[PDB]
Ligand binder design. Sequence first.
Ligand code: NA
Length: 91
Amino acid sequence: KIRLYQFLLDLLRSGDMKDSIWWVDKDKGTFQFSSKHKEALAHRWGIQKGNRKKMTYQKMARALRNYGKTGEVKKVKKKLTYQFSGEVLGR
DNA sequence: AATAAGCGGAAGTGGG
DNA sequence: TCCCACTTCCGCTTA
Ligand code: NA
């Protein structure tokens, strides 16, 4: 089953939900969610995973926060903005 | 107030 | 047994 950071990286590469997520500085791996359109992306994540409940942005961000300690994704001090690690980007 | 972003402890679910 | 990789729930804090 795909991991959340990989789902997000794949979306950014495909551009399939450009109104929900975008690169800020792709060389640094920083990206940002849409305030108004992030829920549609969260819904897609839950459906891809086959979860029992509807996925929300709040629950998806709860999962994202767990990557802070291992480093795959870190929160940036800007609204709705995060940063992939170099290791994640290189793979 | 209304709305929104951000946080994380705790317990539950999946698939090894 | 016991960790993976989240998911779900709940209460709190700041803007
Ligand atoms: Na929000």
